[PDB]
């Protein structure tokens, strides 16, 4: 499936996607996307829309 990440770094906001076989794999890829851009913080996941958020 396609998973989405909404990144909120404050002034900087990102929206990306990844194809993954499951949510756990998408999550790991999204975790590395977030920290590559200096965003470490609070995570949420909505399985109904396959949408993660990470907020500084």
Author numbering: 1 to 56
Mind quoting what the paper says about this structure?
Thus, we chose to engineer the loop L1 of the 56-residue immunoglobulin-binding domain B1 of the streptococcal protein G (GB1).35–38 The solvent exposed loop L1 in wild type GB1 is a type-I β-turn with lysine at the i + 1 position and threonine at the i + 2 position that lacks a COi+1 → COi+2 n → π* interaction. However, to have a better control over the turn conformation, we decided to introduce a type-II′ β-turn. Through subsequent X-ray crystallography and computational analysis of synthetic GB1 proteins with amino acid substitutions at the i + 2 residue of the β-turn, we show that amino acid side-chain identity and its rotameric conformation have a direct influence on the strength of an n → π* interaction. Gratifyingly, the thermal denaturation of the GB1 proteins shows a good correlation between their stability and the strength of an n → π* interaction at the β-turn.
Encouraged by this result, we next incorporated serine with moderate helix propensity, valine and threonine with low helix propensity at the i + 2 site of the type-II′ β-turn. With the decreasing helix propensity of amino acids in the order Ala > Ser > Val, we noted an increase in both d and θ between COi+1 → COi+2, suggesting a gradual weakening of the n → π* interaction at the i + 2 residue. Thus, to obtain a quantitative estimate of the n → π* interaction energy (En→π*) at the i + 2 residue in 2, 3, and 4, we resorted to NBO analysis, which clearly indicated a decreasing En→π* in the order 2 > 3 > 4. The Ramachandran plot of the i + 2 residue in the type-II′ β-turn of 2, 3, 4, and 5 revealed that, as the strength of the n → π* interaction increases, the torsion angles of an amino acid in a non-helical region in the absence of the stabilizing intramolecular hydrogen bond are gradually altered to occupy the right-handed α-helical region. 5 with the strongest COi+1 → COi+2 n → π* interaction displayed the maximum stability (TM) and 4 with no detectable COi+1 → COi+2 n → π* interaction showed the least stability. We were surprised to note a very good correlation between the TM of these proteins and En→π* between COi+1 → COi+2, in the absence of the stabilizing COi⋯HNi+3 hydrogen bond.
